Amino acid sequence: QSTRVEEGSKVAISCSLMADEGVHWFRQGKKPNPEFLVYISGIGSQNPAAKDKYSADKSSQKVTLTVKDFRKEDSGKYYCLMVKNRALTFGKPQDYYVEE
Amino acid sequence: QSTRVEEGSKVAISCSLMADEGVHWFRQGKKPNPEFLVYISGIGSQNPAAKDKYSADKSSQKVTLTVKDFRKEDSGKYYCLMVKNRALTFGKPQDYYVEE
């Protein structure tokens, strides 16, 4: 089911949402608790600002999360979501792993 | 890993967050796309309002999602989350399933 990625490569993860407002990224890895990664605003600014590991970029209402230097601890199911009208909408989740 | 639940029973799902603002619930089932369930506001009002299947209730900053008449299509990993300061915080996920 999950896609094997070469250790140390750069993985560009697509969000299928029409990103007209801000988009949150999180992942569910092997560890029990999910991890918030980054948020990118409607105008394209990311929080936290640092782009050395997780770089969220937006063009024409399409947001892409680039996970740089993909390692075993980055393996998991990646989710993008938008909060609108007291509800959540999700992109298609994407699953990536480094062989252990 | 997941907890087997008796078909048709009522499952009260705990959210470990200190729920001082509103809490969203969603689940990841066998189907690829996650499903938004319900949101409960800081003051305790749920959207959508209907409580016949998913009833989110709050007391003393603790939110509990009750899944009534638990069936095979309700099996999955249940998440609660809060959106604060351009980021997401998650409760401990909880996993429930009906034997198939």
Numbering used by the authors:
A (entry chain A), B (entry chain A): 5 to 104
Question: What does the study report here?
Answer:
The CD8 molecule is a type I membrane glycoprotein with two isoforms, CD8α and CD8β, which can form homodimeric (CD8αα) or heterodimeric (CD8αβ) complexes. To ensure efficient T cell activation, CD8 acts as a co-receptor to stabilize the interaction of TCR with MHC I on the surface of antigen-presenting cells (APCs). In this study, CD8α and CD8β orthologues (termed ScCD8α and ScCD8β) were identified in small-spotted catshark (Scyliorhinus canicula).
